[PDB]
Design an enzyme around this catalytic site. Structure first.
Site, PDB file in Angstrom:
ATOM      1  N   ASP A 189      38.342  -6.962   7.471  1.00 37.25           N
ATOM      2  CA  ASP A 189      37.643  -7.465   8.650  1.00 37.25           C
ATOM      3  C   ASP A 189      37.420  -8.963   8.494  1.00 37.25           C
ATOM      4  OD1 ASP A 189      36.179  -7.907  10.892  1.00 37.25           O
ATOM      5  OD2 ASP A 189      34.675  -6.354  10.502  1.00 37.25           O
ATOM      6  N   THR A 190      38.236  -9.755   9.192  1.00 37.62           N
ATOM      7  CA  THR A 190      38.055 -11.201   9.182  1.00 37.62           C
ATOM      8  C   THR A 190      36.833 -11.632   9.980  1.00 37.62           C
ATOM      9  OG1 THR A 190      39.453 -11.562  11.127  1.00 37.62           O
ATOM     10  CG2 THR A 190      40.540 -11.468   8.976  1.00 37.62           C
ATOM     11  N   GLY A 191      36.292 -10.755  10.818  1.00 34.97           N
ATOM     12  CA  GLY A 191      35.092 -11.043  11.568  1.00 34.97           C
ATOM     13  C   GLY A 191      33.806 -10.745  10.841  1.00 34.97           C
TER      14      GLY A 191
HETATM   15  C1  LIG Z   1      30.481  -8.628  15.554  1.00 36.71           C
HETATM   16  C2  LIG Z   1      30.783  -9.583  14.403  1.00 36.71           C
HETATM   17  C3  LIG Z   1      30.057 -10.918  14.598  1.00 36.71           C
HETATM   18  C4  LIG Z   1      30.402  -9.001  13.033  1.00 36.71           C
HETATM   19  N1  LIG Z   1      30.942  -7.649  12.772  1.00 36.71           N
HETATM   20  C5  LIG Z   1      32.345  -7.599  12.321  1.00 36.71           C
HETATM   21  C6  LIG Z   1      33.317  -7.003  13.355  1.00 36.71           C
HETATM   22  O1  LIG Z   1      34.662  -7.134  12.872  1.00 36.71           O
HETATM   23  C7  LIG Z   1      33.099  -5.521  13.702  1.00 36.71           C
HETATM   24  C8  LIG Z   1      33.619  -4.543  12.627  1.00 36.71           C
HETATM   25  C9  LIG Z   1      33.286  -3.111  12.970  1.00 36.71           C
HETATM   26  C10 LIG Z   1      31.949  -2.703  13.001  1.00 36.71           C
HETATM   27  C11 LIG Z   1      31.660  -1.391  13.321  1.00 36.71           C
HETATM   28  F1  LIG Z   1      30.363  -1.012  13.344  1.00 36.71           F
HETATM   29  C12 LIG Z   1      32.632  -0.445  13.619  1.00 36.71           C
HETATM   30  C13 LIG Z   1      33.944  -0.885  13.582  1.00 36.71           C
HETATM   31  F2  LIG Z   1      34.930   0.003  13.865  1.00 36.71           F
HETATM   32  C14 LIG Z   1      34.296  -2.189  13.266  1.00 36.71           C
HETATM   33  N2  LIG Z   1      33.744  -5.239  14.978  1.00 36.71           N
HETATM   34  C15 LIG Z   1      33.121  -4.670  16.041  1.00 36.71           C
HETATM   35  O2  LIG Z   1      31.954  -4.336  16.099  1.00 36.71           O
HETATM   36  O3  LIG Z   1      34.028  -4.526  17.050  1.00 36.71           O
HETATM   37  C16 LIG Z   1      33.620  -3.844  18.257  1.00 36.71           C
HETATM   38  C17 LIG Z   1      34.498  -4.411  19.375  1.00 36.71           C
HETATM   39  O4  LIG Z   1      35.733  -3.725  19.257  1.00 36.71           O
HETATM   40  C18 LIG Z   1      35.468  -2.371  18.871  1.00 36.71           C
HETATM   41  O5  LIG Z   1      36.349  -1.973  17.863  1.00 36.71           O
HETATM   42  C19 LIG Z   1      35.652  -1.931  16.597  1.00 36.71           C
HETATM   43  C20 LIG Z   1      34.196  -1.631  16.944  1.00 36.71           C
HETATM   44  C21 LIG Z   1      34.019  -2.348  18.292  1.00 36.71           C
HETATM   45  S1  LIG Z   1      29.849  -6.553  12.093  1.00 36.71           S
HETATM   46  O6  LIG Z   1      30.628  -5.370  11.725  1.00 36.71           O
HETATM   47  O7  LIG Z   1      28.726  -6.470  13.016  1.00 36.71           O
HETATM   48  C22 LIG Z   1      29.239  -7.284  10.563  1.00 36.71           C
HETATM   49  C23 LIG Z   1      30.005  -7.149   9.404  1.00 36.71           C
HETATM   50  C24 LIG Z   1      29.544  -7.708   8.217  1.00 36.71           C
HETATM   51  C25 LIG Z   1      28.335  -8.387   8.214  1.00 36.71           C
HETATM   52  C26 LIG Z   1      27.574  -8.520   9.377  1.00 36.71           C
HETATM   53  C27 LIG Z   1      28.020  -7.963  10.570  1.00 36.71           C
HETATM   54  C28 LIG Z   1      26.295  -9.278   9.108  1.00 36.71           C
HETATM   55  C29 LIG Z   1      26.262  -9.433   7.570  1.00 36.71           C
HETATM   56  C30 LIG Z   1      27.663  -9.055   7.042  1.00 36.71           C
HETATM   57  O8  LIG Z   1      28.437 -10.227   6.724  1.00 36.71           O
END
Ligand code: A1CNI
Lengths: 99, 99
Positions: free
Chosen positions: B25-27
């Site tokens: 996860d690059t995000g």
């Molecule tokens: C939003 C950004 C800013 C941060 N997120 C990283 C995203 O890559 C995230 C990964 C994800 C999370 C899931 F719950 C379920 C998944 F299947 C995937 N994607 C996401 O929610 O995507 C959505 C839209 O598309 C849909 O597909 C996938 C899900 C839906 S995080 O996970 O909130 C996070 C990670 C680490 C940390 C923090 C926060 C804070 C401290 C630590 O550093």
């Protein structure tokens, strides 16, 4: 361009005639953008993440220029903490992970 | 290995002698793993994403072999829906975005 991950992979995007900065997120299946006013009809939808779920507006067939690369796909708009470029658009600009 | 983004970038990880599947996860700035019994001292912490916030245990200096590549860094354990490898560990295994 090759992007290292020692800092957030933030890129400049142009959407709806508006310039914004978005996070290239390989962990996101969909593209979700903070509150913005985008033209066209939209559909209510619910998307989930780490903290739970948010209600977003689904806009389909939306043009985005990500770092000078053009793509058209579904864009979700709602209360996201940060603009996210998901895999639905990353595949269109030929993004790959390398290690 | 080069990874295309048509499917979720899932990799096999070895952590605490346990095999799991994790999302590159690059995000994500940090690594967040589902509930598991990890050794060492920890400190309570709260992290936020899409949908809200979750409470995690901060573990520092944890070894994780991600797809055969070794890295030591902070690992967060809590009620995440999916195991996500954040940039704190991706940088150690030399992961770059390419387009
Ligand atoms: C939003 C950004 C800013 C941060 N997120 C990283 C995203 O890559 C995230 C990964 C994800 C999370 C899931 F719950 C379920 C998944 F299947 C995937 N994607 C996401 O929610 O995507 C959505 C839209 O598309 C849909 O597909 C996938 C899900 C839906 S995080 O996970 O909130 C996070 C990670 C680490 C940390 C923090 C926060 C804070 C401290 C630590 O550093």
């Amino acid at each position: 361009p090759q992007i290292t991950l020692w800092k957030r992979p933030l890129v400049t995007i142009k959407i709806g005639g508006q310039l914004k900065e978005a996070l290239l997120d390989t962990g996101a299946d969909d593209t979700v953008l903070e509150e913005m006013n985008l033209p066209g009809r939209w559909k209510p939808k619910m998307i989930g993440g780490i903290g739970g779920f948010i209600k977003v507006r689904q806009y389909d067939q939306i043009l985005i220029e990500i770092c000078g690369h053009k793509a058209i796909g579904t864009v979700l708009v709602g209360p996201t903490p940060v603009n996210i470029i998901g895999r639905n658009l990353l595949t269109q600009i030929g993004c790959t992970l390398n290690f």
